[PDB]
Symmetry: C4
Subunit: 206 residues, 4 copies
């Protein structure tokens, strides 16, 4: 874990996320905890043109590396790291299913046993607030207190985990759940859910 | 910016648009402002067989280059350029989500903050009128007065911007919005929207 | 137009159809008019393993080339050729949208001006009848009398045209229409349609 | 049929399943009957990094090869083999359509003649039970008594057949049926089905 190997790795997450359909028109960003702060994708420079040299390091105070412009979503990446000390990588994105669920302002309940993968019996939704402002940072932080992903209302998805591969994987699983929810939800309401006890066994068992 | 570099670039937009799923069976066309008129894709010649030599230049009077047949959608490309002096590239297409929204004859409202990217709090729909006729040109022109994209009822999508990469990007973002709209709209009506004030902050902030 | 160049071409239609999403698990077949009868894909041999040598010629009497087994759908390919003398290539498939429309037993009406591409103001549905039997052949034949594609109820899609590229293209456009229909139809019923007069202009104009 | 050629083949099923969209984030597993027990994918090792050396052989008693960890789904693979003596390959997965149907707890009825491919006039759903426990094994076993695939409620799909290519193919066809079901089902309920007699002809005829 040098800076340049995490930089390559961050960029690999971008092309992997694009591949899967989790990122459209360069909407999302990706970051890893580093030193006293983090390493994040910069704004502007289109994904397919990126290198290790462009990755920006924002320190713990919000002091970025002169000469580079961090993504605009960096404020709620830092919120994610102080909210969950165990998080080492954040993934942000506007995957279509997540975003439509977040536009209904809904948590996904326990419609499948993989719900437990984000730490509990649901994936919450954080209330809307103008991008890059203090209050959005605070909404994200309340949401990730006991959950490892969250929807952002009228906006998108933020997932966090112990490394990029597991963060990238969780973004992806939350996107399958969103879709299963919306599809079933067009047929019936409420959709059937597993109980809190059965979920209790799944969490223990994980 | 020579003619041949814009020609290559126009064709790159075609294969990029096809890649993303924004163009099916060679439905759309693409054009850039050039000299006194524009440069457009020709009719017939299938997309994957195209070269710089085929791109046609239609002058400002509607006088095309002898020996080539402009696309059939060229009339509302020219309508786009006289309607919005700031537009330098037009993208047309029949992306499935846009077209289904345009078949319900509906504007997409402010269901997500990226709505502001087309200049306001909605993506309008221009009334139907037989392809390639004076009145369709006029409907497109009213629609793009204060908007940078528009749906075309029972037809498709037209997006415009300062260059091909940003025009291509906007086609794509309007297609994500369409989909989010129709998906959420199968669950509930009306779908929740951001207010005109919150949109007002988003536009300022862009 | 030798036999081997049409054979290559038939196989290219298969990999093109697969690419687009029009063929799943080797469901469809493809055929061109040849001599007194036609040339068709054989049964069994999986698509990605095919060569010109495998293509079968079924004569006009139903007499196939010893040593090969024509597809099982060959009976309604021959029905297509005697029904429409102008047809030179047939495409069959179970594209998901078509098939779901054909499972509701519905014609797609004039929800978009490309409806005219199959010869009229609708894409019909032929009643169900056990695969490969005389009566299914007859249902297909009534349906293609005044139309160039048709849905097959509880089954799939059959498209025909002057060559493979235009037949393949029409399969594809009927699949976009199916989807637009079903998507809009989950929101509202009946879905809006263009009138018979406006369609009348579109047909003339084509 | 050596161990290493079935190992390669198992892994080829994985990349083929991923390709088609039947496997997301390494959710499914794949197994073939071998000797007195079977050969299965191991847990952990991500799909794109796999080799023949990693495939595990679990004997008929549940005694695995020291040094390797079988998948966690191995218990209902063995249930599949003792339930259906004719099965030589099992495919498991969480394909999105199947899973949403299995979340409504529904069998897919006879909405298309390919329903007969799994042995009867429906694809059943086995009741939910904590992964990897005796009772889930028993539910899977009742379900596959007279069927060659089954949904698993709030979970996924299990398909079985005479070889990997036909097992992989059946997973895929059950996924097309699921989708056709859910799509049509958003428009109307109940969806139209073919009768038990017409199905009776289809089974005979297969
Ligand atoms: Zn964002
Ligand atoms: Zn058009
Ligand atoms: Zn068929
Ligand atoms: Zn599973």
């Amino acid at each position: 874990m040098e800076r340049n190997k995490l930089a390559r790795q961050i960029i690999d997450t971008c092309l992997e996320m694009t591949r899967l359909g989790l990122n459209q028109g360069t909407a999302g960003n990706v970051s890893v905890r580093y030193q006293d702060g983090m390493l994040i994708t910069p704004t502007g420079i289109p994904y397919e043109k990126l290198t290790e040299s462009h990755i920006v390091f924002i320190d713990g105070n919000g002091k970025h590396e002169e000469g580079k412009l961090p993504s605009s979503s960096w404020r709620f990446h830092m919120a994610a790291y102080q909210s969950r000390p165990d998080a080492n990588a954040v993934v942000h994105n506007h995957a279509v299913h997540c975003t439509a669920v977040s536009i209904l302002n809904r948590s996904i309940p326990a419609i499948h046993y993989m719900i437990a993968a984000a730490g509990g019996n649901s994936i919450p939704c954080a209330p809307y607030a103008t991008f890059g402002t203090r209050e959005l940072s605070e909404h994200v932080a309340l949401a990730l207190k006991n959950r490892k992903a969250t929807l952002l209302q009228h906006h998108g998805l933020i997932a966090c985990e112990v490394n990029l591969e597991k963060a990238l994987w969780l973004a992806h699983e939350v996107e399958v759940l969103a879709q299963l929810y919306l599809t079933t939800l067009a047929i019936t309401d409420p959709v059937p859910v597993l109980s809190d006890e059965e979920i209790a066994v799944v969490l223990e068992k994980f």
